[PDB]
């Protein structure tokens, strides 16, 4: 009764269904992302790119492009270089 | 949150306004009007007027008002 | 042979030569549906041609569902006019037919087991994955789905000549494995 | 080829604060490291379904060619390993079903089947078509059917295919129906759910294939078969 | 269980459930038990430096008595290379427990022993 | 049983507990996948390892923070193969009359007590060691200590290896 | 700043019209009227979800459809709203959906 | 080590490399160094 | 039945706005006046660039412009379509059919295109 033949694993169809139901992140307009981007900066002075993506819910490439124009990367030797939401 | 994000929109709107060729200085209240920041808090207003708009290297204090700094930038 | 495949679907891509605003098109277009989370194009359907077309922000459009070359071009032009009627400078540039799908029946059962043995270099029969034999013709680059019931589906043709030429080549082969 | 530094023994081997100053360094190539992990995955899958080491060795060779050929570089290594394991079983004359390979692999059946087609194209090789008799020994042994019932099922499926009573049916579906027919005609009777679970075939599919061969049941059975249940009284469904 | 935790950690981290069967590596117990008996190196193959050797030996089939003797053999902790008379001596306490006569001649005198009959 | 339950947390929380152990007869799998009982003589001739499949019952409980607990048990999960000592309670030859052993090409006088690993009959030699948990006082003539009382303390059921004081 | 669906309905239209009358009389500032509409949308949305437990069925023909920002704008012709208690006929209906 | 010098890597990175080079060179001649790790053959057997 | 549901909505609406009316400092008398008015109101072309060769390839655009016909506003759980037909798993919502207001919780709809 072990390793019974199966077309797809139950854990895999659920994850596939969840990904399909959620759908891919859409590329929103720059103005809305900027407004949401700066509102996030208010809560925390420093933000990680991986965590920042979740707040913005935007594609990584699109978020980086908009963040690159205004945001800058500050190198921290303690952990790693992260992004700065302050334009200056 | 609050007290740290409205400034970025002011800077970006200021940068975009300069790109249009408007070198004239703009008041804090005037810039707030076009950035949808009419509800900006009072203690935020003073902080911008005292620290943000002077410490930044892209803000020029001219006749009291604030204007871009294209002179420092190479044009 | 006496049997001519009948086209079931044609895929044609045409460039409108102008960037388009997908959100604006969806709001104003009659049948357009835009779901950026799902797909990055605008899906529109017109009933009289009975075809579906996808519109991208780059201005390139893909038309599918046409049953003939004339229908595909006519359907594609109609879609371009709809976008043009929305205020965009849509044009009809480098219209091309990308794929032609044809289906037919040989009117006799086929022994797919024998066919794959004699044509293992071109055939691929996997009952677990698909109940129909997949034949990849080389001289015309046409992929044929041969079934035990005799139904044959041709796809990947750029012109109607390939569809007929491909069937003419495979029909004698199928006749040799008649069941 | 390389040597690993052993564990420290004296105080000179350890840094000023505990940790050893001479520590092993990862000097393995990325290509070799990935290939090493795939072989580990290939052996893990094989042990799950008790495949002999010769099939694993054939799978490892298949993966190396595909990995070096680099036509499947876009696909996950586990899917390539799973597809190579499937191909190795076919090449050795003991095919496993795509579902059986998927059970021992995190990769789904669809992705194994897709990599399987690409690997054949990349290797310019082919696999002989599976027959109903390629699964009888494993399916019947797993169902705990006697040799006589296994022989009856093997004959029924082979005769049914020859008589073309199940055209276009998957060989696994035919075999499961034949096992059900043979099982119901002997003392050891197995339900459709039981046979489907081992065969990886939905009981509906067994019912459909069985219904096609049921009309000619007496012809399919071996002549020297002792019917615990007479062929006339076999289930009609 | 270490690899079951490691495997399940990767899937749970990604937010998807994990298949329990795919988490289990059956080679760990099958090969680990087989290797120790196959080679006699007692412990882990990677840690063979500290692994006790000679625990597993090919059964002697020269004679039936030799076969029986090999199944009742006792190995002393003292290393064969090391030399020390006291562990090799026939201690009083071996009466009725260990054969006072059966012992190999050479480096293993007194170190390899055989159970008394009862 | 003594193994701690595996707790996963990274939010949903997964618990795994290994309940009960099952052992089947020494089985051999043909290349086609059909299992069959492995006779010791076949293991010797074909260089097989005389091993019994090992199965464990595993209970998987998941807590999703929604105040709902889902518990599923994976009965008899294969976790590996244990080599079997011949003529032991779990060997195929166990409980076979001398006549039955001859039918299997096995010598009735053969005492068992050994393993067949890759067809090689392997015997584990009894390893002699100092008793644990007992206080022993010894005198070292050369060492800096006049006397030394040691105790090799080990957990019940022989858990993490002996600790000496 | 909410879903804002039922504003363009008989219930929504009446509420909007009433606020206009007060505004013309200077009784309520324009900001207050927006807040009242916002609160109404929250109440109606919750009201429909909880206190409505009746199922309906309908059939017809679709003439046009649209989709944007998770908003459908179906246009059905000759719809037949069929219910266990009663049947309702209509020449044309527009179904607007959101999520 | 040569690449690190050419690439101008950090001093501590080079120092760790020099430590390994000293160990490998030393255990190429004598692999029974007292109070030092042994060079194994990827299988637990010390190198000769 | 529907009027009774409308009355319950009024109670929720007035209650939900009491806190807001206190936040802005407006007198509570405004709410009482609002309800009174609200109740009363209810009761061979080788050169293909020119597309002008085809005309009248559209329909009247005033269907959505008018919107005077019955309009249904609701929420969708699932919306599936298979090459001819549109299926609608519309959840709780509202309908405006011939002026009369209809309320539903589960709605199933099949349409042909």
UniProtKB/Swiss-Prot annotation, chain A:
Location of the protein in the cell: Nucleus
GO cellular component, one term: transcription factor TFIIF complex
One GO MF term: RNA polymerase II general transcription initiation factor activity
Signal peptide from the UniProt entry: none
Main location: nucleus
Residues annotated as binding DNA: 77, 79
Entry annotated with the keyword Methyltransferase: no
Record's keyword terms, sorted: Acetylation, DNA-binding, Nucleus, Phosphoprotein, Transcription, Transcription regulation
GO biological process, one term: transcription by RNA polymerase II
Taxonomy, superkingdom: Eukaryota
Subunit details: Heterodimer of an alpha and a beta subunit. Interacts with HTATSF1 and GPBP1. Interacts with URI1. Interacts with GTF2B (via N-terminus); this interaction is inhibited in presence of GTF2F1.
Family: Belongs to the TFIIF beta subunit family.
Role noted for this protein: TFIIF is a general transcription initiation factor that binds to RNA polymerase II and helps to recruit it to the initiation complex in collaboration with TFIIB.
Protein's UniProt name: General transcription factor IIF subunit 2
Organism of origin: Homo sapiens
Entire-sequence positions represented here: 151 to 238 of 249
From Swiss-Prot, chain C:
Name this polypeptide is given: TATA-box-binding protein
Residues of the full protein shown: 159 to 337 of 339
Protein encoded by which gene: TBP
Entry function: The TFIID basal transcription factor complex plays a major role in the initiation of RNA polymerase II (Pol II)-dependent transcription. TFIID recognizes and binds promoters with or without a TATA box via its subunit TBP, a TATA-box-binding protein, and promotes assembly of the pre-initiation complex (PIC). The TFIID complex consists of TBP and TBP-associated factors (TAFs), including TAF1, TAF2, TAF3, TAF4, TAF5, TAF6, TAF7, TAF8, TAF9, TAF10, TAF11, TAF12 and TAF13. The TFIID complex structure can be divided into 3 modules TFIID-A, TFIID-B, and TFIID-C.
Disease listed for this protein: Spinocerebellar ataxia 17: Spinocerebellar ataxia is a clinically and genetically heterogeneous group of cerebellar disorders. Patients show progressive incoordination of gait and often poor coordination of hands, speech and eye movements, due to degeneration of the cerebellum with variable involvement of the brainstem and spinal cord. SCA17 is an autosomal dominant cerebellar ataxia (ADCA) characterized by widespread cerebral and cerebellar atrophy, dementia and extrapyramidal signs. The molecular defect in SCA17 is the expansion of a CAG repeat in the coding region of TBP.
UniProt main location, coarse: nucleus
Any single biological process term in GO: transcription initiation at RNA polymerase II promoter
Presence of keyword Repeat: yes
UniProtKB/Swiss-Prot annotation, chain D:
UniProt-recorded Gene Ontology molecular function terms: acetyltransferase activity; DNA-binding transcription factor binding; histone acetyltransferase activity; nuclear thyroid hormone receptor binding; promoter-specific chromatin binding; RNA polymerase II complex binding; RNA polymerase II core promoter sequence-specific DNA binding; RNA polymerase II general transcription initiation factor activity
Listed result of changing residue 53 to Q: In a colorectal cancer sample; somatic mutation
Repeat (Sequence) residue spans along the chain: 45-121, 139-215
The keyword DNA-binding appears for this protein: yes
Predominant localisation class: nucleus
Result for mutant: residue 216 to E: Inhibits interaction with RNA polymerase II
Top-rank taxon: Eukaryota
Effect the entry attributes to changing residue 106 to L: Reduces interaction with VP16
Outcome of swapping residue 114 to E: Inhibits interaction with SSU72. Inhibits interaction with VP16. Inhibits RNA pol II transcription activation induced by VP16 but does not affect basal transcription
Chain residue ranges for the region called Necessary for TATA box-bound TBP complex formation: 165-237
N6-acetyllysine carried by residues: 159
Cellular component annotations (GO), alphabetically ordered: cell division site; chromosome; germinal vesicle; kinetochore; nuclear body; nucleoplasm; nucleus; protein-DNA complex
Record PTM text: Acetylated. Autoacetylated; autoacetylation at Lys-159 stimulates transcription activation.
Chain positions found as Phosphoserine: 13
Protein residues bound to DNA: 73, 75, 110, 117, 169, 193, 202, 205, 207, 211
Reaction(s) catalysed by this chain's protein: L-lysyl-[protein] + acetyl-CoA = N(6)-acetyl-L-lysyl-[protein] + CoA + H(+)
Record's keyword terms, sorted: Acetylation, Acyltransferase, Chromosome, DNA-binding, Host-virus interaction, Metal-binding, Nucleus, Phosphoprotein, Repeat, Transcription, Transcription regulation, Transferase, Zinc, Zinc-finger
Region (Core promoter DNA-binding): 110-114, 170-173, 204-207
Keyword presence, Membrane: no
EC number from the UniProt entry: 2.3.1.48
Curated annotation (Swiss-Prot), chain G:
Gene Ontology cellular-component annotations: cytosol; nucleoplasm; nucleus; transcription factor TFIIA complex; transcription factor TFIID complex
UniProt keyword annotations, A-Z: Host-virus interaction, Nucleus, Transcription, Transcription regulation
Compartment(s) where it occurs, according to its Swiss-Prot or TrEMBL record: Nucleus
Matches recorded under InterPro entries: TFIIA_a-hlx, TFIIA_b-brl, TFIIA_gsu, TFIIA_gsu_C, TFIIA_gsu_N
Top-level taxon of the source organism: Eukaryota
Coiled-coil residue windows: none
Record-level GO BP terms: positive regulation of transcription by RNA polymerase II; positive regulation of transcription initiation by RNA polymerase II; RNA polymerase II preinitiation complex assembly; transcription by RNA polymerase II; transcription initiation at RNA polymerase II promoter
GO terms of molecular function: protein heterodimerization activity; protein homodimerization activity; RNA polymerase II general transcription initiation factor activity; RNA polymerase II general transcription initiation factor binding; RNA polymerase II-specific DNA-binding transcription factor binding; TBP-class protein binding
Assembly with partners or alone: TFIIA is a heterodimer of the large unprocessed subunit 1 and a small subunit gamma. It was originally believed to be a heterotrimer of an alpha (p35), a beta (p19) and a gamma subunit (p12). Interacts with NCOA6 general coactivator. TFIIA forms a complex with TBP. Interacts with HSF1 (via transactivation domain).
Family, as annotated: Belongs to the TFIIA subunit 2 family.
Name of the protein: Transcription initiation factor IIA subunit 2
Biological source species: Homo sapiens (Human)
Gene expressing this chain: GTF2A2
